[PDB]
Subunit: 124 residues, 2 copies
């Protein structure tokens, strides 16, 4: 839990983002991501999970925290389910459409460096 | 600790701010306030304390978390030491100049409703 988050934070920082872990984000009511990160006018709101399976279920209640967090800010806000698929030694992300249950697989996620590219391409 | 924060959050919400408590903001390194709040393009970064004394010392390390938090956002950012002076049954705030040790008293703080007025007067 703690270790994967610290790893993601370090990867975010090497991409040029300020990134910070939020500690007791528990099943509690508070709209807080596991990690938030900024670079310029972009804010990331991240649920962070690592697994040795090939899929991960994330619950509506947790996804909703990501979105409620973003809605409080006037920055460009991108919510992410960031998953370390340890089988392939890969960080992948899925951008949630809305607050619902989501099964993240290799097929519906992208490599995190692709996300970084999408953000750069928008800078234009 | 928990109860004063929940009270401040409720007061913030009645002023029209989205406000959220951050749980394990401990003497730890993470730049996280006790509470953050937004309304429009303004973000508050708050260290929250209640006391039965007439002064409160806040440490540089804690003040710095407020500021490092704000510096990650492109919103208007106002750091606050929000103190419930229980002797007079009053929430007062001090806006820190910079990261240093600060002794908050009645004399160098203002009523929190005055802070709210200053923000409104700027909207113009």
């Amino acid at each position: 839990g703690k270790n994967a988050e610290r790893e993601l934070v370090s990867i975010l920082r090497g991409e040029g983002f300020n990134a910070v872990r939020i500690p007791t984000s528990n099943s509690s009511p508070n709209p807080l991501p596991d990690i938030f990160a900024t670079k310029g006018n972009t804010l990331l709101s991240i649920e962070c999970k690592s697994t040795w399976e090939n899929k991960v279920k994330v619950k509506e209640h947790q996804v909703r925290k990501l979105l409620d967090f973003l809605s409080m800010f006037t920055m460009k806000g991108v919510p992410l389910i960031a998953i370390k698929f340890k089988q392939v030694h890969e960080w992948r992300v899925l951008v949630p459409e809305k607050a619902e249950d989501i099964i993240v697989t290799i097929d519906n996620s992208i490599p995190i460096e692709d996300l970084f590219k999408i953000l750069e391409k928008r800078i234009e």
